[PDB]
Write a protein that binds this ligand. Structure first.
Ligand code: HEM
Ligand SMILES: C[C@@H]1C[C@H](N(C)C)[C@@H](O)[C@H](OC2CCCCCCCCCCC2)O1
Length: 396
């Protein structure tokens, strides 16, 4: 079986990748491909198998188990809980699990509500009643919340939309590398700027942790932890809010239902995650030994991508999978992963999305998509499902 080239597709595959994935699931669970970027990885498709592989400790997240080389810039950033296995994963996550529980997150609700209120105020002041939702709300909300939590100064934040329109979605390989180096350079200087200043933000608390005992949180892990916590939502929450609003605006009858009964709101957010969540493939996994998936043997050290998008379109698990239905049973979706690496930010992502979605519906009369779906442009990236821009309008 050849290597299916996804850069060849090309296309087209950016707009709607799903039939490709379903086409593979038909044959079997595991498939060699080459990305638009051009790397040889395995894809794992189909719900049951995707779910199992996410939580299977035969598939490592530690790059020591991978045969793929890292650049120096990549390596500088990889001492984080997501690119670790137990016991390191266990020790790292314990350092911040208390910060991110539902109940600690619930305390942020007034402030999140306040940030959204202000962003929409600003949005609604447009004379023509037209906006790009990505710029006015989807981007600035998550960055503002996570920057306050971690103590990134307001003037420093604009650089991050630049670095992420690079780490996450490049446009040139060397420039993703440059972005990485600059980001790491900056986070290191930010870390140093907290020392001895008695800050109460999370980054200042992590600095003292590391300084009190380097075996509990090394200086590399400290930088890794700042990095992962900061990037995670720039790539994800931004896209859930934009993909989800697009979902709703492009299924007017679901929008109408949600307007008629806002108690449906949490369920609608879940179905935005199921139908078009931002993570289309989970982060890299590395078999620690050959792994046989229904007669396909994945060799030790190869790159394995769990395709969450396909799992979410598996009809035996999610009937009429292509229907966006805000009242669907979404229980068991994979949009936040599964197993020891299950999303730590999930309560915070859900709080930000639920508040943003509610504010839009409540405050934008006759909110509409302001281009046809066919004119929207999705990033070519097959790991992150995200839009370049989301034009909307409302009645002024
Ligand atoms: C809608 C928004 C979000 C989505 C869809 C999402 C999705 C995910 C997924 C799928 C994973 C598992 C990756 C894998 O197994 O390969 C994950 C892990 C992780 N997420 Fe989230 N995420 C979101 C928001 C956030 C936010 C806001 C934060 C930071 C507060 C965050 C921090 C992390 C961290 C640190 C991990 C690694 C956890 C571990 O390895 O134990 N995420 N996320
Ligand atoms: C550590 C990984 C390595 C990948 N690589 C090509 C440099 C990158 O795309 C990924 O993604 C970001 C956010 C985008 C993927 C979201 C998956 C779940 C969020 C957890 C944080 C990962 C960081 O960070």
């Amino acid at each position: 079986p050849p290597v299916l080239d996804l850069g060849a597709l090309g296309q087209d595959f950016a707009a709607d990748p799903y039939p490709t994935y379903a086409r593979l699931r038909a044959e079997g669970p595991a498939h060699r491909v080459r990305t638009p970027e051009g790397n040889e990885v395995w894809l794992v498709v189909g719900y049951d198998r995707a779910r199992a592989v996410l939580a299977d400790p035969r598939f490592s997240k530690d790059w020591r188990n991978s045969t793929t080389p890292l650049t120096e810039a990549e390596a500088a950033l990889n001492h984080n809980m997501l690119e670790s296995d137990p016991p390191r994963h266990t020790r790292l996550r314990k350092l911040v699990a208390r910060e991110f529980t539902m109940r600690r997150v619930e305390l942020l609700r007034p402030r999140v509500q306040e940030i959204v209120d202000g962003l929409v105020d600003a949005m609604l002041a447009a004379p023509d009643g037209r906006a790009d939702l990505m710029e006015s709300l989807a981007w600035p909300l998550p960055i503002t919340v996570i920057s306050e939590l971690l103590g990134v100064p307001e003037p420093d934040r604009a650089a991050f939309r630049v670095w992420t329109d690079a780490f996450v979605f490049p446009d040139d390989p060397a420039q993703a590398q440059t972005a990485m180096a600059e980001m790491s350079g900056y986070l290191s200087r930010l870390i140093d700027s907290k020392r001895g200043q008695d800050g109460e933000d999370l980054l200042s608390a992590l600095v003292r942790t590391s300084d009190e005992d380097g075996s509990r949180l090394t200086s590399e892990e400290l930088l890794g932890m700042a990095h992962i916590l900061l990037v995670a939502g720039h790539e994800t929450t931004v896209n859930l809010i934009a993909n989800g609003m697009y979902a709703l605006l492009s299924h007017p009858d679901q929008l109408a239902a949600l307007r008629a009964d806002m108690t449906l709101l949490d369920g609608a957010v879940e179905e935005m995650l199921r139908y078009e969540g931002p993570v289309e493939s989970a982060t890299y996994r590395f078999p620690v030994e050959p792994v046989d998936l229904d007669g396909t043997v994945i060799p030790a050290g190869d790159t394995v991508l769990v395709v969450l998008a396909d799992a979410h379109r598996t009809p035996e698990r999610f009937p009429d999978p292509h229907r966006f239905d805000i009242r669907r049973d979404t229980a068991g979706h994979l949009a936040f992963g599964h197993g020891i690496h299950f999303c730590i930010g999930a309560p915070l992502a859900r709080l930000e999305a639920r508040i943003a979605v509610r504010a839009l519906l409540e405050r934008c009369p006759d909110l509409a998509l302001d281009v046809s779906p066919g004119e929207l442009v999705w990033y070519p990236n097959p790991m992150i499902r995200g839009l370049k821009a989301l034009p909307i309008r409302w009645r002024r």
